[PDB]
Write a protein that binds this ligand. Structure first.
Ligand code: HEM
Length: 152
């Protein structure tokens, strides 16, 4: 469980993200796809993209980045009391999109990397550890729902 101090660090950097939701979503998805190409293959929408330049030029990709970060932001602002927000996410990602928990670990890594690149003054070690804990909590709670549903 995160402390109030930890949540403050998480939400302080997150408020910086929300000044450019779409730029962050691009950077995060591109990092994910480049670092872990098996993730790209889960997106029928995006698997035609073969280069970073093509990814950066895709408005559809940029749109989806906003969808992802918007959902994450709503979860983080619940500070742990996010069960209603995760239910539908866990359900779609387990049963429709077929996304393993490991891939949620991968996108967590991408998020943390992009936050450090874009917001280093608000993303020192204390904030990095707090964000790690927040995204761990996210994964933990999704993983429990996957397990309920027979997906992990
Ligand atoms: C921070 C983690 C993530 C969040 C907050 C998130 C959020 C969302 C949201 C809000 C949607 C649309 C509503 C829905 O279908 O549930 C969606 C769709 C989808 N997500 Fe995620 N997602 C996350 C991670 C991933 C990862 C790691 C993958 C793949 C490796 C993934 C694959 C998909 C796919 C395939 C769709 C459908 C895209 C489409 O329209 O064709 N998601 N996600």
């Amino acid at each position: 469980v995160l402390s109030e101090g930890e949540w403050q660090l998480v939400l302080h950097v997150w408020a910086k993200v929300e000044a450019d939701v779409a730029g962050h979503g691009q950077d995060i998805l591109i990092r994910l796809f480049k670092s872990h190409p098996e993730t790209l293959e889960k997106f029928d929408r995006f698997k035609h993209l073969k280069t970073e330049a093509e990814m950066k030029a895709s408005e559809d990709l940029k749109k989806h980045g906003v969808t992802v970060l918007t959902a994450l932001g709503a979860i983080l602002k619940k500070k742990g009391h996010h069960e209603a927000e995760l239910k539908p996410l866990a359900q779609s990602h387990a049963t429709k999109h077929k996304i393993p928990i490991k891939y949620l670990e991968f996108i967590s890594e991408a998020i943390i990397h992009v936050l450090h690149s874009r917001h280093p003054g608000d993303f020192g070690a204390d904030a990095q550890g707090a964000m790690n804990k927040a995204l761990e909590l996210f994964r933990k709670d999704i993983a429990a729902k996957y397990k309920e549903l027979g997906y992990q």
